[model samples]
Target: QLVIMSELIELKQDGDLESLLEQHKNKLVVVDFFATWCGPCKTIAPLFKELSEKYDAIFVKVDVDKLEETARKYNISAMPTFIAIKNGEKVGDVVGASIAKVEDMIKKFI
Candidate 1:
């Protein structure tokens, strides 16, 4: 239900992480490492999806609990860790759930 309701594609599996980054190497990639139970996550989600569509980039979502390994690999310790990637490498990141900061970070990559 959540997946269907959201515009961001899910990083639902281990291989999905690599595939997403690899597929969008030439384009900007915005990743939202979020959890369903996260309050702050709920706050910025709408903005995340909105900007994803307005901006030209690949937007993705990862449930922290479901993708623990991926989170650990990325060193995400917060509920809403938003990462911006370009050319298959991490370019910028945002911890917590501020729409302004995340949007600004994404603009840099976009």
Candidate 2:
């Protein structure tokens, strides 16, 4: 069974991102940058959901359409981009939802 991490939250404003990271500095974070219109974004949502439940890390979703500024700040040109943050900073990123690739990327922070 999947165990969702309670720390997972949807980010709305770029301003709150810093504070949220600060508050969860002790844990690894997987930020999913997705757009509602993107098919791949939908494809990976469930994988992310499942991963969020299995790990004791922070899992956040940043809808590209809703958080354009935040998405631009990260230079996210593609949908379903996954960013790994640790110690309140971005450590790595993956553009798609390849299970092996994402799992490997997250392993660095774990």
Candidate 3:
């Protein structure tokens, strides 16, 4: 597949993720925990993008296969998981393709 990036921050490297988390701590970030091979991940691709544009929060994509440690850090046991964070703490999350629930997460975090 081609490179998947929009305004969302792509956590593609392990070397800087810790620093990245620190860097993004002060901001509201919507973390999309996904795996490239996961069929459910596709269910949120466009929804993720749409929400990224709809809110003031910073959006991030973390592919589980590429960022296993990051996934582990968040305790992600499901594909297409969406977590909202602010100042280094989790504010809310949604674990499925429900756009309204995900949207609610965004609104709740903000």
Q: What is the C-alpha RMSD of each candidate to the true structure, in Å?
A: 5.1, 2.1, 5.4
Q: Which 10 residues in a row give candidate 1 its minimum summed lDDT?
A: 1-10
Question: What TM-score number comes out for model 3?
Answer: 0.84
Give the deviation of candidate 2 from the true structure as CA RMSD. Answer: 2.1
When 1 and 3 are scored with lDDT, the better candidate is 1
What does candidate 2's lDDT look like per residue over 15-109, in tens digits?
Answer: 66777788887988888998889998888888887777667888889998887878898899987899988887789999886756777887767
Model 2 lDDT on a 0 to 1 scale: 0.82
Residue range 10-108, candidate 3, lDDT tens digits: 787664556666876666778888888888788778878877776777788888888877788888898888888888787788887677898887777
Ranking by TM-score: 2, 1, 3
Q: Score each candidate by Cα lDDT.
A: 0.82, 0.82, 0.77
Per-prediction TM-score to the true structure, in the order listed = 0.88, 0.88, 0.84
Off by over 4 Å in 2: 1-6
Report clashes for each candidate as comma-separated counts: 0, 2, 0
